[PDB]
């Protein structure tokens, strides 16, 4: 809301399932201006070679 | 956003100094006041029309330059 | 020789993040505010 000035930032870079929460939680004032530039996915982190 | 490229005071000065310049035609010369518009379609009164031409050839040539300079900075913003 | 290890004290005070926290204690002052038209004669 403060934009690039007043100590704020221009853009937030987050993962896609965080951002699809933020659009619904706020009003219709933001939109993902690009596509995904690193498309990997999530997962469970185990002990190595378990 | 249409009338934006001039200040609100400029739209009254420009529309004001077409009637005061239009009243200068009456010195060389509702239904009676429309007779000057039939005379100002296209001596000393011709010299009034020469300077008034280069006024309108500036208010044409600045309203373009402040409708461009809005429609570019609106595009080339951050 | 006090200047050598209070040089290493400040770098160990800064990697931990204590220079900013003291800066938040005193200097937390951020209240800083911030088309085309035409006029001539």
Swiss-Prot record, chain A:
It is found in: Cell membrane; Plastid, Chloroplast membrane. Disruption phenotype: Impaired glutamate-triggered (and Ala, Asn, Cys, Gly, Ser-triggered) membrane depolarization and calcium rise. Slight reduction of photosynthetic yield of Photosystem II. Overproduction and aberrant placement of lateral root primordia. Induction: The induction by glutamate, gamma-amino butiric acid (GABA), malate, aspartate, acetate, wounding, touch, and cold stress stimuli is abscisic acid (ABA)-independent, but calcium-dependent. Cold-mediated induction is rapid but transient. Highly expressed in roots and at lower levels in leaves and siliques. Expressed in seedlings, cotyledons, roots (e.g. root hairs, epidermis and cortex cells), stems, leaves (e.g. vascular bundles and hydathodes), and siliques. Expressed in root phloem. Glutamate-gated receptor that probably acts as a non-selective cation channel, at least in hypocotyls. Can be triggered by Asn, Ser, Gly and, to a lower extent, Ala, Cys and Glu. May be involved in light-signal transduction and calcium homeostasis via the regulation of calcium influx into cells. Plays an important role in the calcium-based fast transmission of environmental stress. Acts as a negative regulator of lateral root initiation and development. May restrict primordia numbers and position along the root axis by a signaling process originating in the phloem. Forms a heteromeric channel with GLR3.2. Belongs to the glutamate-gated ion channel (TC 1.A.10.1) family. This is Glutamate receptor 3.4. It comes from Arabidopsis thaliana.
UniProtKB/Swiss-Prot annotation, chain C:
Disruption phenotype: Impaired glutamate-triggered (and Ala, Asn, Cys, Gly, Ser-triggered) membrane depolarization and calcium rise. Slight reduction of photosynthetic yield of Photosystem II. Overproduction and aberrant placement of lateral root primordia. Induction: The induction by glutamate, gamma-amino butiric acid (GABA), malate, aspartate, acetate, wounding, touch, and cold stress stimuli is abscisic acid (ABA)-independent, but calcium-dependent. Cold-mediated induction is rapid but transient. Highly expressed in roots and at lower levels in leaves and siliques. Expressed in seedlings, cotyledons, roots (e.g. root hairs, epidermis and cortex cells), stems, leaves (e.g. vascular bundles and hydathodes), and siliques. Expressed in root phloem. It is found in: Cell membrane; Plastid, Chloroplast membrane. Coiled coil: none annotated. Belongs to the glutamate-gated ion channel (TC 1.A.10.1) family. Glutamate-gated receptor that probably acts as a non-selective cation channel, at least in hypocotyls. Can be triggered by Asn, Ser, Gly and, to a lower extent, Ala, Cys and Glu. May be involved in light-signal transduction and calcium homeostasis via the regulation of calcium influx into cells. Plays an important role in the calcium-based fast transmission of environmental stress. Acts as a negative regulator of lateral root initiation and development. May restrict primordia numbers and position along the root axis by a signaling process originating in the phloem. Forms a heteromeric channel with GLR3.2. This is Glutamate receptor 3.4.
């Amino acid at each position: 809301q403060r934009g690039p000035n007043a100590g704020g930032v221009a853009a937030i870079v987050d993962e896609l399932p965080y951002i699809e929460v933020l659009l619904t939680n706020s009003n219709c004032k933001f939109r993902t201006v690009g596509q995904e530039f690193t498309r990997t996915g999530w997962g469970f982190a185990f002990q190595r070679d378990s | 956003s249409f009338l934006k490229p001039f200040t609100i005071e400029m739209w009254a000065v420009t529309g004001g100094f077409f009637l005061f310049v239009g009243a200068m035609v009456w010195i060389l010369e509702q239904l009676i006041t429309i007779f000057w518009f039939s005379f100002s379609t296209m001596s000393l009164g011709r010299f009034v029309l020469i300077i008034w031409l280069f006024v309108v050839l500036i208010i044409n040539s600045s309203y373009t330059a402040s409708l461009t300079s809005i429609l570019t900075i609106r595009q080339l913003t951050s | 020789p006090l200047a050598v290890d209070m040089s290493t004290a400040i770098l160990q005070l800064s990697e931990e993040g204590e220079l900013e926290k003291i800066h938040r204690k005193w200097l937390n002052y951020k209240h800083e505010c911030s088309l085309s038209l035409k006029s001539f004669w």
